[PDB]
Amino acid sequence: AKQSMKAREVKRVALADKYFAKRAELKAIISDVNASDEDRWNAVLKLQTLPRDSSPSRQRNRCRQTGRPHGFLRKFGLSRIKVREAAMRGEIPGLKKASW
Amino acid sequence: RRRVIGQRKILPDPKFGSELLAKFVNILMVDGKKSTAESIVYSALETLAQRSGKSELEAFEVALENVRPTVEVKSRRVGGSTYQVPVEVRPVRRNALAMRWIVEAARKRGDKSMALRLANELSDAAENKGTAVKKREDVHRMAEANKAFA
Amino acid sequence: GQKVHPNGIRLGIVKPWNSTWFANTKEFADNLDSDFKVRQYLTKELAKASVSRIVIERPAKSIRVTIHTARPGIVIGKKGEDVEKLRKVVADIAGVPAQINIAEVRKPELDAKLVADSITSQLERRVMFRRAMKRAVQNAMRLGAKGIKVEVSGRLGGAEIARTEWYREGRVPLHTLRADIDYNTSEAHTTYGVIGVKVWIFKGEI
RNA sequence: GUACGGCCGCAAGGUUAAAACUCAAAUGAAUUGACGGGGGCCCGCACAAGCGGUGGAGCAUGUGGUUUAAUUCGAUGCAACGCGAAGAACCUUACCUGGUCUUGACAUCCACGGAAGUUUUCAGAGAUGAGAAUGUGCCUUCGGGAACCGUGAGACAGGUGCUGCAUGGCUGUCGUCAGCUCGUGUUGUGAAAUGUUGGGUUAAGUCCCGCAACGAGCGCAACCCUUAUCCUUUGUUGCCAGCGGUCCGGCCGGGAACUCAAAGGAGACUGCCAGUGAUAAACUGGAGGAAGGUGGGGAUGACGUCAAGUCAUCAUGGCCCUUACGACCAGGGCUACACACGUGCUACAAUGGCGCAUACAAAGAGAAGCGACCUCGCGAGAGCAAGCGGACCUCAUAAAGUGCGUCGUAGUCCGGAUUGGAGUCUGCAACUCGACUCCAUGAAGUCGGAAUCGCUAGUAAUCGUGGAUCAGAAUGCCACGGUG
RNA sequence: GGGUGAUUAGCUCAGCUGGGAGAGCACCUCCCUACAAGGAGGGGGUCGGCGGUUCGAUCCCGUCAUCACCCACCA
RNA sequence: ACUAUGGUUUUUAUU
């Protein structure tokens, strides 16, 4: 399990949607200039790029039922093992296993 | 252990209904492409008509008969160490081997235009020298020694 | 080989789902998360109510929730007000209004879910293991089954060794696509080992 | 059957024939396995006949072992090594180091101070540790609380740590192989045999015949799904033969003929006839038709499996740690090679390549998304913006192929890796170890050596299209189509 | 009476820079398997002793002991 | 053509 991997998820993909899923305009202002060979911004780039606990990077969704980083299916909310488990029990609509 | 499988006749040619030509393109087909064979078909016979080509009634069917395979073998066994035996091939196999013998003899060394490398081989297919004949006699000198104890 | 439930591998053979509904392409997985939450809640509240399955339909912009029980009198209470407090919470975790449909199971000793519970009862007081499955076979064939299979695994005796026992009666037939076979696997939670229990029951083709 | 003494022999020896010491089984008889360098006999892309390959070169890429501060943990008889654990700067991480806190990231009951929160400065790699402002919400049997953020107790919490020689479950595979159980009878001293053995014949205990063996189950076979041709029912955002009008566009009326998308009937049963052969059963051949001979094909998995794997999918007995085999951060290791083995893909060409035009889709995916049109520029990119909830737009001029110029055996001015220059972007950030573009750069390499693969048909051979995973980037993993 | 080699690990023995304790079989133990083979890391020394030289002596000189080996020892 | 040899130990079985 290692519950610290969910403690990352809570402050990444579950908190990024209102602040980091669109943010590239907030750095592009430092490339907004009136003329070439002229500066008005200097080192303020290191203040516009100051966050480290949150990023557009390092974002893993993980399986919402097993915390597993590989073998998740977004359309069902299940992993490779639970797709069979729900299908064999008939607990998932529209999906069948054989016989076409 | 019995193969003998199905039955497959294949299709004839679209321009004259030929059964031999529609099979010969399946020997010059490489990478699943028959177009490269259709650049060599008729052009080899028309390039033979720049050097020696007299009569065309059978096209190249008699060049494939002056080319004559005879030295085919099989292996016989009752355990470990095996015994070689020669085989009397059917006309359908004799023809299928003659079709490779001549196009492999035309490929023996690198040059331009396969229709022309094959026309040089078809002009030889009235006297048959070197390629498709000199290996045959050097293994035919065992053809009765490999019958002795059946 | 791979075992798996005879229900969902034969669901292409005129069989019904245990959950049947249609949802939006931006929340189908979240409605299936709800479909799990309603079962994981009800199997903790109705834990003594002899439940054989919970089936989900979603008509009328609500959730129906159909509960197959051999003890409905402790689900609905005395009468119909104890469930008004229950469906309030089912509707809370579903995000929609909730109906609740309560269905009585006539023959619980014919159902693989509750036959495994009836076997688990006698493993508490450790009766002879080879009798415990024969009573479950007898009781099910006397209830209109056309064949039954059983298996019990690990710490059945007697001594420290781990062994398995089975016995089989009548028809299965596991490759028969139309057989509509009833299946279950469970554990008896004993004070040494655990004892694993398996049951397969046949009644007739569809 | 060795010793000592006797007896017989010329003699090797023959004959009489011990004891001490020593172990838990030797042996006769019939029976079931299993193997043979025994016998008969079934069948296999094991052999047979054909072709395309692998074993060189350059890159990508999988494993073991030694090593190391990590080089995570597993899978070695034939059932391990493009594999479980899908896109390694930091991440994700098990592994490893230096920090920090130990009721702890995660869960609850009680006490104690605070609302939850919102802003801003300093110390520090950061975790966090110190300040300076701001807000004081909910319930008010009117008691003082709840709830929420933390902290200090008492019980506790943590563990993808180690064990399938502790297991419930999960699983490899003989094998689509035709075989296996439950009972009753009989024979045999009994274990054991029978039947399940035999005679034809099948993919098959097949389909019949037959013996002291005969029923009921699990397999085989069937169920359900899919298709060649005719007939019918029905048609938009699909179709377009006839007919009116025409952004001349199946575009709009309109038709229902024709693709197609689709439910329903017909058709195929070894049924007919010959040949073999228990005037048997069953095959081989012929006939019909669009076409048979499990129809061509799917889902297919009877028992029992190796002194076999998996506690890293989940539980769980035991061992052990918690001044940590935690967790919160900054960096490492997973891209050490001292040596041991493979799988790909591209060029090795000419029957070909290179450049520049041109024909055809099939199937997915697409409302903070697929992104047209037109551009700014050498170009990646950047700029503006329509249609589209997808039979009504977009991803998207499919590439092989068809063609015209051009290059040529020089071991390739081919193959363009590789080393530089100029860049464009993504992110806190591109030293090693990130994509993509323009202008330079210049290399190995004639299908191979012992040896050895896969397929009998839309198969082998060969060239393109799409999707999931998604900061930026797959030669990774699965479908779709042309040629055949 | 004179020369020459030895005395180092339980057993057999090597001896290159003089700052040196070691190889295999035995003893202990981990890995692979429970062993063994095979891998790897350890335990245990009178380097015969004493004196001298030396920054330090198993390691070079000298000399005492015991063992081997060629010579001399009545004529 | 013909084709050497295989170190130590190895189920509970109840009523």
From Swiss-Prot, chain A:
GO terms classed as biological process: cytoplasmic translation; ribosomal small subunit assembly; translation
Coiled-coil parts of chain: none
Highest taxon above the source species: Bacteria
CC terms in the record's Gene Ontology section: cytoplasm; cytosolic small ribosomal subunit; small ribosomal subunit
Family annotation (Pfam families): Ribosomal_S14
Record keywords, A-Z: Ribonucleoprotein, Ribosomal protein
GO molecular function, one term: tRNA binding
Annotated function: Binds 16S rRNA, required for the assembly of 30S particles and may also be responsible for determining the conformation of the 16S rRNA at the A site.
Record-stated family: Belongs to the universal ribosomal protein uS14 family.
Subunit structure of this chain's protein: Part of the 30S ribosomal subunit. Contacts proteins S3 and S10.
Protein name: Small ribosomal subunit protein uS14
Swiss-Prot record, chain B:
Membrane-crossing residue ranges in chain numbering: none
GO MF terms, alphabetically ordered: mRNA binding; rRNA binding; structural constituent of ribosome; tRNA binding
Domain of life: Bacteria
Outcome of substituting residue 34 to A/E: Defective in ribosome assembly
Result of changing residue 114 to G: Significantly decreases affinity for its own mRNA
Biological process terms in GO annotation: cytoplasmic translation; negative regulation of translation; ribosomal small subunit assembly; translation
GO CC entries: cytoplasm; cytosol; cytosolic small ribosomal subunit; membrane; ribosome
Keywords: Ribonucleoprotein, Ribosomal protein, RNA-binding, rRNA-binding, tRNA-binding
Subunit structure: Part of the 30S ribosomal subunit. Contacts proteins S9 and S11. Cross-links to IF3 and the P and E site tRNAs.
Other noteworthy facts: The strain K12 sequence is shown.
Biological function: One of the primary rRNA binding proteins, it binds directly to 16S rRNA where it nucleates assembly of the head domain of the 30S subunit. Is located at the subunit interface close to the decoding center, where it has been shown to contact mRNA. Has been shown to contact tRNA in both the P and E sites; it probably blocks exit of the E site tRNA. Protein S7 is also a translational repressor protein; it regulates the expression of the str operon members to different degrees by binding to its mRNA.
Recorded family membership: Belongs to the universal ribosomal protein uS7 family.
Protein known as: Small ribosomal subunit protein uS7
Gene: rpsG
Parent-protein start and end of this portion: 3 to 152 of 179
UniProtKB/Swiss-Prot annotation, chain C:
InterPro entries for the chain: KH_dom (IPR004087), KH_dom-like_a/b (IPR015946), KH_dom_type_2 (IPR004044), KH_sf_prok-type (IPR009019), Ribosomal_S3_C_sf (IPR036419), Ribosomal_uS3_bac-typ (IPR005704), Ribosomal_uS3_C (IPR001351), Ribosomal_uS3_CS (IPR018280)
Domain KH type-2: start-end pairs: 38-106
Record's keyword terms, sorted: Ribonucleoprotein, Ribosomal protein, RNA-binding, rRNA-binding
One Pfam family matching this protein: Ribosomal_S3_C
SUBUNIT field: Part of the 30S ribosomal subunit. Forms a tight complex with proteins uS10 and uS14. With proteins uS4 and uS5 encircles the mRNA as it enters the ribosome, which may play a role in mRNA helicase processivity. Some nascent polypeptide chains are able to cross-link to this protein in situ. In collided ribosomes contacts ribosome rescue factor SmrB.
Stated family: Belongs to the universal ribosomal protein uS3 family.
Role summary: Binds the lower part of the 30S subunit head. Binds mRNA in the 70S ribosome, positioning it for translation. Plays a role in mRNA unwinding by the ribosome, possibly by forming part of a processivity clamp.
Protein name as it appears in the record: Small ribosomal subunit protein uS3
Species, as recorded: Escherichia coli (strain K12)
Higher taxonomy: Bacteria, Pseudomonadati, Pseudomonadota, Gammaproteobacteria, Enterobacterales
Name of the coding gene: rpsC
